[PDB]
Amino acid sequence: MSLVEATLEVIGGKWKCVILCHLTHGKKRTSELKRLMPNITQKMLTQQLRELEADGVINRIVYNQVPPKVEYELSEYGRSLEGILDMLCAWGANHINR
Amino acid sequence: MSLVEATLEVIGGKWKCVILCHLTHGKKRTSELKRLMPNITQKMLTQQLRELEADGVINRIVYNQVPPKVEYELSEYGRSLEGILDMLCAWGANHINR
Numbered sequence: 001m002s003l004v005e006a007t008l009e010v011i012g013g014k015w016k017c018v019i020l021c022h023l024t025h026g027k028k029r030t031s032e033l034k035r036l037m038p039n040i041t042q043k044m045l046t047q048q049l050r051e052l053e054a055d056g057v058i059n060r061i062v063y064n065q066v067p068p069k070v071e072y073e074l075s076e077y078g079r080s081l082e083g084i085l086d087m088l089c090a091w092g093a094n095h096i097n098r
Numbered sequence: 099m100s101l102v103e104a105t106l107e108v109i110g111g112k113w114k115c116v117i118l119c120h121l122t123h124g125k126k127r128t129s130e131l132k133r134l135m136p137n138i139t140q141k142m143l144t145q146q147l148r149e150l151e152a153d154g155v156i157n158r159i160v161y162n163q164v165p166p167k168v169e170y171e172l173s174e175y176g177r178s179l180e181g182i183l184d185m186l187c188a189w190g191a192n193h194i195n196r
Contacts, residue, residue: 004119004183007190014103014110021102055193084189085102087182092104098154098175 010055011081015040015048020074021085023058027073057081108153109179113138113146118155118176119183125159125171155179 011017015037022028022036034045049072052058057078063069074081099107109115113135120126120134128143135143147170150156155176161167 002116002119003187003190003194005116006194007186008115010190010193011186012110012115013112014106017102017106017110018100021100081189084182084185087185088105089101091179091182092101094178095108095153096101096104 010051010057011084013048015044016052016057017085017088019045019048019052019072020057020078020081021089023072023074023078024082024085027061027071029069029071033072052078108150108155111146111149113142114150115183115186117143117146117150118172118179121156121170121172121176122180122183125169127167127169131170150176 011020018037019033022033028036030042030045030049033049034040034042037045040048049058049060053060053072056075058072059075061071061073063071109118116135117131120131126134128140128147131143131147132138132140138146147156147158151158151170155173156170157173159169159171161169
């Protein structure tokens, strides 16, 4: 395998960057992420979140209350992806105009 | 859709970014790409090459000869993704090497 392939396993796909984009503007529960992302199933969303947590890119916050409450936030390490996120957004802006 | 989503529509599909990566070395026909990406199916590769062409990031070169042959190259527009690729690898290298 290659570095590119290896890195894509962490931040590739059509969902992770969208999730991170949403989290750059604040912590969110899975239900909020699901609402904001109609093209993804709950199952796939949960799987994407578990991978991102595993990779140390987002932190899972569990509020010990009833009903249950779980929120996700970009970790300190995850913030190091902001530069790439900005580039993707800039490229997308130009593309839409194309 | 958001700006990030627009970009992922073009490069988020499975294998798309790797394909573009391989094409940064030069034009190649489907057979070669198959050898470089031993895990992609013929149908999937065909599907992705078509989407990449439609989004304008790669150009397909048709050789009207005997035997007929077709190659793919990174379009000038596709070249504008090299910077994102550079940062992705830079980030991935820092990630894997812990």
